[PDB]
């Protein structure tokens, strides 16, 4: 039930392009491995894991029907990091840096969504 829209193509070709290459992207390109990291409480706190590797694949595979779905996955990723981790943890500053770039890129997105 997926579509290609102008906003989803923008989120793929402009927003994700910028975030995927960023120096702080590496913890977020793939799901958190709570076993490997030794975080037995991770999945007790985070009930909807999300990462940029999953988002990127959904964009590539036209999984989304509408840009809001992709925006929601980005918000889940960032909030998940802020909820699980502590405010002074490095990972949170990395996530906030990525969120700043996300927001700056989204600010130039077409304001109206249309299928292509």
């Amino acid at each position: 039930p997926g579509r290609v829209t102008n906003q989803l193509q923008y989120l793929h070709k402009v927003v994700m392009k910028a975030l995927w290459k960023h120096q702080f992207a590496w913890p977020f390109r793939q799901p958190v491995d709570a076993v490997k990291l030794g975080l037995p409480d991770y999945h007790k706190i985070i009930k909807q894991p999300m990462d940029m590797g999953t988002i990127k694949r959904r964009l590539e595979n036209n999984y989304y029907w509408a840009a809001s779905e992709c925006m929601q996955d980005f918000n889940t990723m960032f909030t998940n990091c802020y909820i699980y981790n502590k405010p002074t943890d490095d990972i949170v500053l990395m996530a906030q840096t990525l969120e700043k770039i996300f927001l700056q890129k989204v600010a130039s997105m077409p304001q109206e969504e249309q299928e292509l």
Partner: peptide, 15 residues
């Protein structure tokens, strides 16, 4: 493995 608290110690995915 990496530390969430000290994540910036690592420049790339350490696995």
């Amino acid at each position: 493995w990496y530390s969430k608290k000290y994540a910036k110690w690592w420049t790339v995915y350490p696995c």
